[PDB]
């Protein structure tokens, strides 16, 4: 499923991401745009055998188990397939754990490079939330 910007903003708001760990809602929408282009089925294989899954491109080396990654730790205690669902619940709950790891949203490369320090509120403007 490919979310619309405001459709995702609304869903993320319902999931309680607004100001989660101090990150306003726009940060999350912006992160999803650059990580997966709002695509819940996005996947990216890495040179270390791991794979990034879902709308927030969560890595199988640490957060979810896809049973094909060397040195996996499944800290979110979920199968990576749950991160490919049209229902973002699993991605959101894991993202909440990741952003609470100790280094904020910096864990998302796309967020660091295209969202951090920008006017992220722009990402929820017009959404009538």
């Amino acid at each position, epitope marked *: 499923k490919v979310f619309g910007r405001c459709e995702l903003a609304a869903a993320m708001k319902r999931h309680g991401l607004d100001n989660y760990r101090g990150y306003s809602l726009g940060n999350w929408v912006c992160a999803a745009k650059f990580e997966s282009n709002f695509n819940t089925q996005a996947t990216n294989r890495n040179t270390d055998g791991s794979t990034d899954y879902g709308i927030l491109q969560i890595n199988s080396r640490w957060w979810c188990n896809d049973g094909r990654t060397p040195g996996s730790r499944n800290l979110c205690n979920i199968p990576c397939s749950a991160l490919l669902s049209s229902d973002i619940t699993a991605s959101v709950n894991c993202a909440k754990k990741i952003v609470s790891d100790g*280094n904020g949203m910096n864990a998302w490369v796309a967020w660091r490079n295209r969202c951090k320090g920008t006017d992220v509120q722009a990402w929820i403007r017009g959404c009538r939330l």
Partner: nanobody
Amino acid sequence: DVQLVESGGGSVQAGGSLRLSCAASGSTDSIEYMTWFRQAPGKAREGVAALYTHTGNTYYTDSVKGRFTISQDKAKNMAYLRMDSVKSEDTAIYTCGATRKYVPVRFALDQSSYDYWGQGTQVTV
């Protein structure tokens, strides 16, 4: 990829200080963690101090807390290990490690969490 070069190793008397440098080449802000590991003679390699470059947060193994300080110069892809008040137990080959992927903090001092390594520098107390 990332190349890691260490420098600053050598002899130091117990109680003295030494500063190690780790210079990375092959990327800049894609590097996530820059970390120092060490391997004492006849022992297994252990994480000593880790630094997450995008926040400057640091993580230390208990035996060096308060004595060693890891810092960086993000612009130059440099990581430094200031070893203050060294002890005989600190004798070892110090090696720099790095990753271009996020690593949960709880595993930031584990060697298996790193994808790039320097060649090591000897420190003798």
